[PDB]
Design a protein around this ligand. Structure first.
Ligand SMILES: CC/C=C(/N=C/c1c(COP(=O)(O)O)cnc(C)c1O)C(=O)O
Ligand code: NA
Ligand code: NA
Ligand code: NA
Lengths: 383, 376
């Protein structure tokens, strides 16, 4: 439940039972051979795992420092790492006797991923999405619609991802008997931060095996963008006990940290409680939650997962920020240099890795988690 | 050179030298250990091969007949099989001493695939080709120059690229995107797509312990279909079925079913089937932009004539139903081209027994087609 001070289960009493039953079922199935055979079978044949580890040779030699490798989550079915978690939880929900999935989404990749999983398993899917995000993400909304899910626009509060979560939590309170709330990042009340991390850890486990094959040694740094923190935990987690492996999380610096228009919860936020968890949140002078921003819509969440708050506290992971302008510059750089169009979220990690590689030596190694493909962001990059 | 009477090399004398040098370079490098090492390394780490073979269980059980398996080329980097060919040809060109790739594009997936390969290999890329306007900006982002043409039609891309290549062949490779054009292009593209069928054979043997009863693939120019077909051609019991674009109906005249309703003739350096009016080349149509080409590859013309493969058609409407069906039933949004294959596999599956096995080549993902499906 806790990662030092952070985490917990800050929910109305009515959700304590449901959360206890999710925890029981997860403990019962996480190590069950059939559940794992089925999960791995879906990951292989449907999602297309393992994803490759790619050496960005031209980008490395152009910068002239450390080797930059890219963990290719952009090649997962759906175009993002979110699928790994969606197909982990959705069959668990089925085993618990649930017939409906609900979820929040901001960039729409988790919403799409939840819809894909629901379609495959034949479950009802309702996706809560902030009205401002629905207009912003018309295409992923259509993907969700074509996959048989209903997208419910949220007109509460600030009409974005935090508001979608509040509506989903409200729905789940009234529908938990037959509905699973498929949370899409390492956030929410226990056990969700742990469950989502566990279903994303496959990324790090593959990357470890793959870098050992390519180089014979663990990397010097792993770099991942951080919204709520699931792609980063996924690649970080299997290296946590490899002490010499540096872990860097990249948050959205937006228009700048001094601009007040960013999404860097760990960097500039303060401790608070929201959506069932005690963690870092961007909050105003008075004490309520602050409006976040990023050019990358998947980084627009004003909080971060408790496990990252923890890793930051014990100084196991370093957390940095990169701006809209730097992320956009990385999006173009990778596209022309390596022929890979990254998600704007992932471009933040690419951007920081480019800075760090220059400062590092030629025989050192960085793995960048390329969390998704950029197809969804073409209209945004045009601007 | 030929596949039966079909194929060949009917071009101006000025292209005979360039094509001859391409043949020789391809012969030199096709089975070169190092060339294949590079190619396989890029196909693995960059393109994400192998792609999985997926058992569409919900779809299979709903229809109530043969097992439907999908070869997931939708998961290849770029979202389509066209990548397999682009990444095969581009290093060949570089080895030959070229610094520049040119290409045609219909649905933009080849245009993008070429741009992607060119970016990867640090080669200049100029492409000839609104309906797939997301792919047009993808190309720009990838560092390619798009040359819009002024017929102003997609077949005029294949026309314009040849004109350019006549002048620039000393340092320019014309990267053809399907199993079409003068020898050796239909062979080269087929060879580079055959990795699809080599994977599928090993995967279906792993999964079912036997070869499939039918392989179904959509057919535009015919490359994804040749890719999956070719390794099974010598397996007699495996039926091979190509699905052409039926458009608004065969009786409407607005289709791209070259093999089904076209006439034999010469175009773009090859003898094959084309849609013709007076014997003159005729415009095609399909809701699936990748199938919207009046001609077809000579190896399919050959396969049809010897009856090794059967060629059928699926209408725009049928393709649209299959698009929605696969999305809703299996959580896979297929390319509209690929949706023709799914639509035919669904009819065929119904007739067949529960023990029988169909592999559908899912040639692409449908992210490119969302606007088109929206308007419909
Ligand atoms: C809070 C909503 C976040 C979403 N996506 C976040 C995201 C992120 C950031 O999410 P995390 O990995 O959990 O830090 C990174 N990469 C891609 C491709 C993403 O889509 C979504 O709704 O789709
Ligand atoms: Na793969
Ligand atoms: Na955040
Ligand atoms: Na045709």
């Amino acid at each position: 439940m806790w990662f030092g001070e952070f985490g917990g289960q800050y929910v109305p009493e009515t959700l304590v039972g449901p959360l206890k039953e999710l925890e029981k079922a997860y403990k019962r199935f996480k190590d069950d051979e059939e559940f794992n055979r089925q999960l791995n079978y879906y990951l292989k044949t449907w999602a297309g795992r393992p994803t490759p580890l790619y050496y960005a040779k031209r980008l490395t030699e152009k910068i002239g420092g450390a080797k930059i490798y890219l963990k290719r989550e952009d090649l997962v079915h759906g175009g993002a790492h979110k699928t790994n978690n969606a197909i982990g939880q959705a069959p668990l929900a089925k085993l618990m006797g649930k017939t409906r999935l609900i979820a929040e989404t901001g960039a729409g990749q988790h919403g799409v991923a939840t819809a894909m999983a629901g379609a495959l398993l034949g479950m009802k899917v309702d996706i809560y999405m902030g009205a401002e995000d629905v207009e912003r993400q018309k295409m992923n909304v259509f993907r969700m619609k074509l996959l048989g899910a209903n997208v419910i626009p949220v007109n509460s509060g600030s009409r974005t991802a935090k508001d979608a979560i509040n509506e989903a939590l409200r729905d789940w309170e009234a529908t938990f008997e037959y509905t699973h709330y498929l949370i899409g990042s390492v956030v929410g009340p226990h056990p969700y931060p742990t469950i989502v991390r566990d279903f994303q850890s496959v990324i790090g486990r593959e990357a470890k095996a793959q870098i050992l094959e390519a180089e014979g040694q663990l990397p010097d740094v792993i770099v991942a963008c951080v919204g709520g923190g699931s792609n980063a935990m996924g690649i970080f987690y299997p290296f946590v006990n490899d002490k010499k492996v540096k872990l860097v999380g990249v948050e959205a610096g937006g228009k700048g940290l001094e601009s007040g228009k960013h999404s860097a919860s760990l960097n500039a936020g303060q401790v608070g409680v929201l959506h069932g968890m005690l963690s870092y949140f961007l909050q105003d002078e008075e004490g309520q939650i602050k409006p976040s921003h990023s050019i990358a819509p998947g980084l627009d969440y004003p909080g971060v997962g408790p496990e990252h708050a923890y890793l930051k506290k014990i100084q196991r992971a370093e957390y940095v920020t990169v701006t809209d302008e730097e992320a956009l510059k990385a999006f173009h750089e990778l596209s022309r240099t390596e022929g890979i169009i990254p998600a704007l979220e992932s471009a933040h990690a690419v951007a920081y890795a480019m800075k760090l590689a220059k400062e590092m030596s030629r025989d050192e190694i960085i793995i960048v988690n390329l969390s998704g493909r950029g197809d969804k962001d073409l209209d945004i990059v045009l601007k």
